[PDB]
Structure formats: C-alpha cells, structure tokens
C-alpha cells in the first residue's frame, strides 16, 4: 500500500535535434500509467502534453541533457532541478525532455574518421599557424538540450522548471574550466538565447532565432542547431545540438539549452567549449534542490504525488 | 552513480547522533562512519575517502525553529556545493546540522493554550509592560550548520560549512558566504536568545550555540523561559542558539546574531557559510533545506 504515484518522462527513444513523435511516446510508455499527447506541428512539436489527474501537491523534477564530445574529454553533463507545485485536476502540463548534443566522433565519412582515430593531423597543422580554425572547421560537440516543464495561463506559456543542458566540448578541449552553474528564479529576467559565434549558442525560453547553428528557444519549438557553414562545406562534419535548444558545434563547442541559453565563443577557437545553459525554478513552486549535475546522456522528467 | 549521503542518523535536537543511531540509519547502505562518543567530536561522523579522485561535496544546513504562529514559515538552511581533490584513506569529519526546535505545539496545557491563541498572557505583558520579562518563551531555536572538515597536523581545517537558519520569534535575508580563513569564524551575538555557534570560539552563555571546535551543541533556552513554565526551545546540533521570546541564531562559520533584548517580534539571523580555497564553488549558496541538514558526496562530474 505505497501511496506514491510516479511518472517518468523520457525522450521516447528519440535523439538528435528533433523531438519524439506520438508513436514513439506511445511505444515507450505502453502499458504504463503515463499517457501523453505529442504535438505534431508548430512550436509544440515533440512536446509531451500531460493531463493532471487530481488536484493535489506534486513534485516535479527535471534533468537536462549532456553536451557532445569533441574530436579529440568528459562531456559536460546536464543538470537536475526539483520543485513542489500545487496543480488542479484537468490542468495540462507541457514537458520537453532534452536530448544529448551530438558527438563529433566517430564518423561515417572516412576522412573525418581518420581525424577521429588520430591518423589525420590536418587540423593540428592548421592550428599551429592560426588562432582559430578557418579551413578544416568541425569537430566541436553540439550543446545538450534543456528539459522544460511548463503550463498555459490564459494562452500564455508559464515556466515551472527548466533544467539546463550541457555545452559541447571543443575539438581540442584538454582541461575542464569549472564554471559555476546558474539557476534563475525571477521571471522578469529575460529568458533569451546564448551568444552564437562560429558555434551556436543554446536556445533560451522565449527568443527569436534566425541563425541555422543557434539552438532555437522553447517557444519556437526548441530544435537543435545546425553546424557552421564551413564544417559542412569542407567535409560535411555536422555536430547538431540536441532538442531542447542545444547549439550546433563548429570547431568550438555549441551552447547548452536553458531558460537562458549557454554562450558559444565569438570565433572558431578549437579550445573553446560551449557554456552550459541557465536553469530556472518558478516562484510558484518550492525549490527543493540546487541545480545538480547528473550522469545520463539524454534528459528526463519525474513527476510524483501521494494519495 | 555512486554517492554517499550523510544524515542526522535519526537524531534531532541539540545533541548529535550516537554510533548506534548511525549504524541503524546506514544499515544496508554503502556508508560506514565512526561517530565520536565524547569530547568535541561527539556526534561528528568520520568517513574514510575510498579512492583518490576529485569529488563534489554538497552540504545543507538545518532550518530554524518556528515560533508562536505556524503560518510563519521557518527560515531554511543554506546549501553550499564545492569541488575538492581528496586522496584515498583521507579522513573527512562530517557534522550534519539539526533543525532548531519549534516553540509549538507543546505538551504543557498552559503553553499549548498560548500556542493555539486561547491564552493571551504574553500579549497582555507586551501591552502592559512593552517588553517580555516574565512570560518569556515562544521563540524558535536556531538551526545547526553542517560542517565538513579534515585534520592537518592535528588541527581542524574547514572545507565546507553550510549555515543554519535562524529561529522565528514568538510573534514573528540573502545568503552570506565566506572563503578567507583570516576572517575569524566566531559565534554570533547572544542577547536573551542565543547567537549561533561559529567555527572556532569560546562559548560562555548557557543559551548560546557552541562553536564547532567546542562540539557544536545547540544552546539551551533562555533561563527565564525554563524557570517560569519550562518552555525549552533549544538550538539544533551544529551550533543553533536557544530561543527566548526572540528567535535563536543559526549555526555557521560565523554564527547568526540574536537580538539584543527579548523582543517577541525579532527572529534570529541565519549563520554565515564557508568554502575553503582548497575547493571550487560549484554554484551560488542558496537557502533550500526545510528540515535537518545533510551532506552528499560523489565523484565529480563535469
């Protein structure tokens, strides 16, 4: 007679810059007590819509996704945030589970794969002569998507919890930089995308995204960024950001998704990782944890309430 | 995915757990500790580092006690998360802060009528006398801080200290973080309620929270509250100050101040937290913890 009722939301087996379909989630959640509606078009595509079963107090935990690895270190992991919220029966919650940023290696392109296995030194040769990489661009990991849980109020999205994604590692990342994690709780702070340079910044909560390599913001559908033009033209080395706003890689790493997306570097410096995104807890809820790093590649959401 | 979660082992109040309490609490877990049985290390959990690695050490201090109105939420303890390089077989010393005691409810029928609002003896004293001297009590105790430290050449060296919350006054602030050990980790001011204990001080007053190096016992309540009607509201283990009508201060690296007089509207202040320059601060200190404290240690993840 355990009174705990628990729902675990996953990516439904989806990966990469785009979220799951209704069919994928039905298969993933078959025979469980979890049923979602997955939008098919517009900015709600791949977002899982869940009907609150009873007026009660719920705990809502989110884990963002990890960033991708570079062509040469530990990936930057997503973070988790948990909050307590009072919901009313028949309320609709909107859940976006972040997906991992793409890794640079391995590759089905034989030339790129020789870079990956350490037999092709063309990038190291270019680096010996330049501050950035300009010709042989690529090899930075994509940013991870953030995980978002939100509701509608009078037709307006209201964020409840956002757990940021990790930034992608640069091609030639060799040390960790130990930048502190940020957690926001003031809805008057602008929830915008991070800086894009050669790699894409992470997507925020509500922005206008125009660049192909930038991660899109949540209210635009949170698609992961493409890679920089030169990586594509030279050898097709594309390292996309993850669904949930991850920025695409160049030789530098893409930014992670969040309430505010992580910044990417201004130039294509092969030692510059993307920054992790910024997490968020609504003042409507009670914060129960700081934003803590979590091991797994893709994100997840855990919801619970007690009979 | 492995981690080590230290709790109060089921202990509450001004005194830390026994070895038997931690053995019971940690049974069937991956955690084994030695708990001091006497001296300034009593109630402090000693843990051997299993492997040379970089670790994250997350400390959470305990919340303060409530006062005479349960609508007034308690002041939550502070979280402090750091990254540290540890060597196999190093010994860490872990004091998990305990919640400050609540004034209410009470087993005493007279005190319980005050708690429910059916006895106005304190309110009448406040009107007639403009201050509480006779019917003292009703303020919550301060919460204990959580302390993680090591010994170096026989001297304690602080790594992470996560402050406790001040107690609410009978008739009822940003997180502060220090990282320079030349700013001395002293107790907070005691008035009628006790100040929180700090890292290293000499505690004289019965109602003051003790400093960490004195054993971190929670303060007694103010003597008049004990004498008049036995309204004892003690600080939590980890340096919480005892309550009077005002609230006790929370433990910390520097203890939280209590008010100068027995003002029934004055909460105790939270303690000051600390992180050593031996570590890296992972995220800003943030008040989060509504009950007892805790410590979570795990292998570092980038």
Coordinates of C-alpha atoms in Angstrom, one line a residue, chain A residues 74-79 169 176-183 273 276 286-295, chain B residues 1 54 58 60 73 76 79-81 83 85 280-284 286-290 294 296 298 300-302:
Chain A
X74 CA 34.5 14.2 -20.2
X75 CA 31.3 15.6 -21.8
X76 CA 29.6 18.4 -19.9
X77 CA 26.6 16.9 -18.2
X78 CA 23.1 18.2 -17.9
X79 CA 21.8 19.4 -14.5
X169 CA 33.3 20.2 -25.9
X176 CA 38.0 21.5 -17.5
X177 CA 37.3 25.1 -16.6
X178 CA 34.9 24.6 -13.6
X179 CA 32.5 27.5 -14.4
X180 CA 29.7 27.7 -11.8
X181 CA 26.2 26.7 -12.6
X182 CA 23.4 29.3 -12.7
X183 CA 19.8 28.9 -11.5
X273 CA 33.8 24.7 -25.1
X276 CA 26.0 25.2 -20.1
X286 CA 9.0 25.5 -3.8
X287 CA 12.6 24.7 -4.7
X288 CA 13.9 21.6 -3.2
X289 CA 17.4 21.2 -4.8
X290 CA 20.1 23.4 -6.3
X291 CA 20.8 22.5 -10.0
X292 CA 22.9 19.4 -9.7
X293 CA 24.9 17.6 -12.4
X294 CA 23.5 14.2 -13.5
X295 CA 25.3 11.4 -15.3
Chain B
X1 CA 26.0 7.0 -9.9
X54 CA 38.1 14.9 -7.5
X58 CA 27.3 19.3 -1.1
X60 CA 23.0 21.7 3.5
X73 CA 7.4 29.6 7.7
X76 CA 15.5 27.4 5.7
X79 CA 23.2 24.8 0.6
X80 CA 26.9 25.1 -0.3
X81 CA 28.3 22.9 -3.1
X83 CA 34.6 20.5 -5.7
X85 CA 40.5 16.8 -4.6
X280 CA 35.9 25.3 -6.1
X281 CA 32.4 26.7 -5.5
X282 CA 30.1 24.9 -7.9
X283 CA 27.1 27.3 -7.7
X284 CA 25.9 30.2 -5.5
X286 CA 21.1 29.0 -1.8
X287 CA 18.6 28.6 1.0
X288 CA 16.7 25.4 0.4
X289 CA 16.5 23.0 3.3
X290 CA 13.4 22.9 5.4
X294 CA 22.6 16.7 5.0
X296 CA 26.1 14.4 -0.2
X298 CA 30.0 11.9 -5.1
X300 CA 33.0 14.8 -9.7
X301 CA 31.1 15.1 -13.0
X302 CA 31.9 17.9 -15.5

